[PDB]
Amino acid sequence: PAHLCFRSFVEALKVDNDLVEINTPIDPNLEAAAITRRVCETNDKAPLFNNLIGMKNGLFRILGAPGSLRKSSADRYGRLARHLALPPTASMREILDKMLSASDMPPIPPTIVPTGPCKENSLDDSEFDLTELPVPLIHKCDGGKYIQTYGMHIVQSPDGTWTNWSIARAMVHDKNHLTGLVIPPQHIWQIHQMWKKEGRSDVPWALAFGVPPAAIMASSMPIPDGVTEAGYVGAMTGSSLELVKCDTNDLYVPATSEIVLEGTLSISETGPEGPFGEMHGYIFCGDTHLGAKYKVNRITYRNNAIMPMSSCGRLTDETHTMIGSLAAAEIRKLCQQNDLPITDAFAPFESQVTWVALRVDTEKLRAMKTTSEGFRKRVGDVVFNHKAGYTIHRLVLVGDDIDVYEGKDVLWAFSTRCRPGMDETLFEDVRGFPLIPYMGHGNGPAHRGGKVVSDALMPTEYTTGRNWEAADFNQSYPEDLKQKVLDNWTKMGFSNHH
Amino acid sequence: PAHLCFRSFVEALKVDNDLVEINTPIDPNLEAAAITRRVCETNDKAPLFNNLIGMKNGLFRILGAPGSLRKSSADRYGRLARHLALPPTASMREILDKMLSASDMPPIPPTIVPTGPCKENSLDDSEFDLTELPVPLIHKCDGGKYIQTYGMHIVQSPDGTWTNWSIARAMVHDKNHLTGLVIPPQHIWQIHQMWKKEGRSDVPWALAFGVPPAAIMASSMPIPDGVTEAGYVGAMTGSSLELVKCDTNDLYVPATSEIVLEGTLSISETGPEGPFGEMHGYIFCGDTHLGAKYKVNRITYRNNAIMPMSSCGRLTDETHTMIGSLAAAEIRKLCQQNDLPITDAFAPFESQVTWVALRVDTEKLRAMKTTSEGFRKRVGDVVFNHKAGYTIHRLVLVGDDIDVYEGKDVLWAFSTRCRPGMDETLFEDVRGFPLIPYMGHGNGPAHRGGKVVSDALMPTEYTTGRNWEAADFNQSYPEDLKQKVLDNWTKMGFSNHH
């Protein structure tokens, strides 16, 4: 099935009429990423580049925009639904519920199998050169060829008890090394730290590209510390994932992985990394810093391997649909587990996924007999002191009438119900997300503060209940009149799903 | 011409295929406003209700949505352009420049003429009853029938030197009185205060509905204190406006006015006013307060008179397209007159026109050799201490790459370049706009504070110049590649003005 095998996922997009196969030569230097960028900016069909200039020995085709949006509102999130065995018309609420469902289920550990398609071909250290592969230059100011935008890094705690799967960027350094971001509080960083403190050896590592779509979704989600993503994906899908051992280490990769790199993440060495055109929409040309360094010892890959690629930047791509939404999902749960009356959470695209709107059950709120200042502080302490709140700099609290999955409605509530200053609490002593330009390239500390809880609950939502109705068609007119108007609409001369 | 005669304006909308004539009976109790509301929420054609239940003796037809948006992007602002003799494809920049053009021209005073269409019919105090006219109930919780949503109040200073034209709401109180909002710092209020201090007499008053479209635009704009709107409109249009004297007082009304009320605004009496479904999208049911009281002594009107109506509330109507944009225009000029390097200003619809984005000439800014904290304070002091800043609670400063007329781009810059708290200055000792729910129905003083300058200039925009490029199709790819991609787009299989 498509959720369990990337090759099947590509076939699913084709059958959905959601994929454009480009069989003429396309340059991995900027052209593939430019086409992908335009797809993302216009919600077009995913591009599959079958004829990439410089592809050799089967490495590699590219699929762009794997988790981006479709044009129609009815199946807007269909490419995400296809990661998860959900109907293509699934709502965001349904997708995030699916992604949270495993959080109160027993893990289903993976099953080891002796081989799989990822072993169809191999290149040893004397046979590959990463500078000879058709690795894309994604943005013209990028500081490297970013091979790794949609693969899963696999690292394991020294004691073997936790195996983490996560997305973090990496670019080619030389024939057999990458550099990339490994930053706190991310799990790749947490595990790296464990190995560094042990001080014995570099971290055994693999990077698998074109993994089971359900696994790349979990890779992008801040599920709890110490939780092995493979078991969470197993529980979510109701099926044990099939993994095969790496040839040169004892880590396990999805059997149907398109391309696998095997090697080490150094506990001592660094190398130049970045800049990269990032999720918030910018590239700071020449802004290169030392990053984590990976050595590649072996490549294995499927016949006619396909590399997924995120051509990320301005709206809308994987960095918005997956980073933002999956963090919002985890934050929703975290708030509920802390006894806060939050029903729903979403990161508005309009905020460049730097905000999360939290829908409040105001019946529950009223029973708490609290105030804005107290509630704001409590919510911000829970979220901004936790890893799930890392990427989010503004929380907007809204009452039950707002659909947080609708950015227009979030912006309306924020703009009209939250008095600047008075209805907000600033948080300066929390971890900040340095990738946001106003953090890393701003006026203050790159790694601390810059966060805010903005309360768009109105005063009576804490006491006696909402005391307005909207000045809109829906609420300011009785049902019988509304229906008459709709029934006579085209008749009168005015204009009128899938 | 359409800009100088409301009847001609209606004819222009017809010819533009921007008007739906409804000749079957429509109820002024909610139905007309519900149809209008749906038009505004969907950017449909303006409705002209030719058969209003309860219309008698020629009073009256209704035109809804006179200044609302069209569906197509190419002529989005066409209904505003038709107020001003501009091409229907005019940009917002062009419309606001037209509205500011008279600010450095000599006034063209109006011309008195002996009669006009507004004198075709008359009703004396023994012949009309305002509770018998088909005055609309616009929202179901409104505290009155709001006769006055798109007419022009006309009041004159005691000394005769300043005649003000402005829009302020009013509803029917009884057979020969209205109540309405007359609040500081508005000119109707400033003039009222002059009469109250003189203490001799009630204020001579007229309310003209269906006035020259260019005059209703100025009526909605905060042009300076002491400036007679008629002379400003004269200069803007290059033509002296033709006015006729009222029958029962010595004020002058546009000759082609559809309906004119003549009477007095009391210096001593008040009456119940509101609630009303307001520009920010709400109605607070039962929230009635004492408002200003007007006595009507005489009605004059055109044959087959048409009453314009704003069915205001959630996006998008006259309260957004005219209040927000015309305040932004005046703020742009005010900033320039105070030697601030502002090129453009607009009130984003997404902010419910509570924000104004100010585009900065950053070459000029760099020459000032200043800082964020200093610049923010200076801009906020200029704007928030002036009447033109009354309705605006957040100013967003953006550099030259942002098109402030594009809300998506304003939201991007705000979300990514302004660090909450650190990059903002709050203003608590300025006049606030009580109509905003978080003001009048909020946690703090209804009439003071709640304002903020949010600086979305990046640090190097003050020093050496922008130091990024966008991670977008436009900026992250060379021109020749971009053009190749566009040229091969439909060929490859992807999707493609008026």
Ligand SMILES: Cc1cc2c3c(c1C)C(C)(C)C[C@@H](O)N3c1c(nc(O)[nH]c1=O)N2C[C@H](O)[C@H](O)[C@H](O)COP(=O)(O)O
């Ligand atoms: C979907 C997606 C997620 C991420 C990234 C990308 C995509 C497409 C890049 C295009 C590669 C851009 C890059 O900036 N990137 C990225 C990243 N997290 C990082 O620490 N470093 C990164 O370079 N995340 C987010 C992480 O995947 C999530 O924060 C996840 O929660 C981490 O897993 P874990 O540590 O919780 O196990």
Ligand SMILES: Cc1cc2c3c(c1C)C(C)(C)C[C@@H](O)N3c1c(nc(O)[nH]c1=O)N2C[C@H](O)[C@H](O)[C@H](O)COP(=O)(O)O
């Ligand atoms: C276009 C438009 C403008 C306004 C209004 C409406 C429309 C459609 C209502 C639908 C009637 C809603 C109402 O809230 N309303 C309104 C109002 N100003 C008020 O003091 N009171 C009001 O009740 N303005 C704004 C004013 O027209 C401008 O602020 C103008 O600048 C005033 O003129 P002046 O005092 O500068 O001469």
Ligand SMILES: [K+]
């Ligand atoms: K993860």
Ligand SMILES: [K+]
């Ligand atoms: K609030």
Ligand SMILES: [K+]
């Ligand atoms: K005015």
Ligand SMILES: [K+]
């Ligand atoms: K800033």
Ligand SMILES: [Mn+2]
């Ligand atoms: Mn993890």
Ligand SMILES: [Mn+2]
């Ligand atoms: Mn005025």
